Structure 1
Amino acid sequence: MKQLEDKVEELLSKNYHLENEVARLRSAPLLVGVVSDILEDGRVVVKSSTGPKFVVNTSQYINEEELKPGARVALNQQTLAIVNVLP
């Protein structure tokens, strides 16, 4: 009876850890690129590490100061919006 309660307790735990592993493995990546140049309208041209250059939007939370040519950026994989500026 306390045996069960224990099993319920470790099962809950194992299940929580497995869910977490699922969440981590399923989370979408971001795509790395380099800022090529900033446009008069606040859209940025990025060179994707996939090859092409794109005109993309930028996260409202990004300090636009940090967006300058040569800056390494991380892009949403579908919309290619700048999500982070990277070191």
Structure 2
Amino acid sequence: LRSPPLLVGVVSDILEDGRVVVKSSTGPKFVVNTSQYINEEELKPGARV
């Protein structure tokens, strides 16, 4: 899954439910979880993903 092709976005917002609001460069935002070893503590808005 970490294999290409991958779409670049940035974190918009952090929400109270384990998920981060992600605004992709294409357009639309998505509410999706991080990974296990990627945390919301590590992530920050403006953090490129």
After TM superposition, the score normalised by the length of structure 2 is: 0.78
Paired residue total? 48
| Greater radius of gyration (CA) | 1
Determine which structure has greater relative contact order: mean sequence separation of CA pairs < 8 Å that are 6+ residues apart, divided by chain length: 2
1:51 to 16, 19, 27: 27
- The alpha-carbon deviation at position 61 of structure 1 amounts to 1.3
Quote the RMSD (CA, aligned, Å). Answer: 2.9
Unaligned runs of 5+ in 1: 1-24, 73-87
**Distance 1:27-1:43 versus aligned 2 partners, 3 A rule:** closer
Gaps of 5+ in 2: none
Task: Tell me the secondary structure at the aligned position of residue 8 of structure 2.
Answer: strand
Q: CA deviation at 1:27?
A: 5.1
Distance 1:60 1:34 in 2: 18
Structure 1 ranges of 4+ moved more than 3 A: 25-28
TM-score (norm 1): 0.48
- Whichever structure has more helix as a proportion of its residues is 1
